[PDB]
Amino acid sequence: LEKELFEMLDEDVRELLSLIHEIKIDRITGNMDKQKLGKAYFQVQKIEAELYQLIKVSHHH
Amino acid sequence: SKEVLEKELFEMLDEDVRELLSLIHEIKIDRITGNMDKQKLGKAYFQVQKIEAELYQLIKVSHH
């Protein structure tokens, strides 16, 4: 599922950029970024888990 | 000085995530290609962990 891992990684990482951008603006519109901060939190955890799986796969695992 | 500690955290995050993306892109190429240097994968692992610690700071700083 290396094909899929890479696909998800790229999609999740893009989404994270967007999310960081959205949060930057949310602060400056004086806005509730809380839910978006938390969503970002889980997003990085999910990337970490996918990169960890990528490392297992790359290792004859 | 939390407004500059925030503004720089936002900057680190953006650059670090953009880095992570390029890395995903380069690592893919390396796989299709059988490149023996796997260093971009471990740099990618390092990048998420550094993104994780930055975002955590940004959270702790964003709200008392």
CATH number of B1-64: 1.10.287.660
How far, in Å, CA of B59 to CA of B64, rounded? 9
Residue with tokens 């680190």: B12
Fold (CATH) for A1-61: Helix Hairpins (1.10.287)
Q: How far is A44 from chain B (nearest CA, A)?
A: 6
User: Nearest to residue B46, comparing CAs of A7, A43, A61, A48?
Assistant: A48
Chain B segment 41-60 residues within 8 A of A by beta carbon are 41, 44-45, 48-49, 51-52, 55, 58-59
Q: Cα–Cα distances in Å, from A54 out to A35, A51, B14?
A: 28, 5, 23
- What is the resolution in angstroms? 2.6
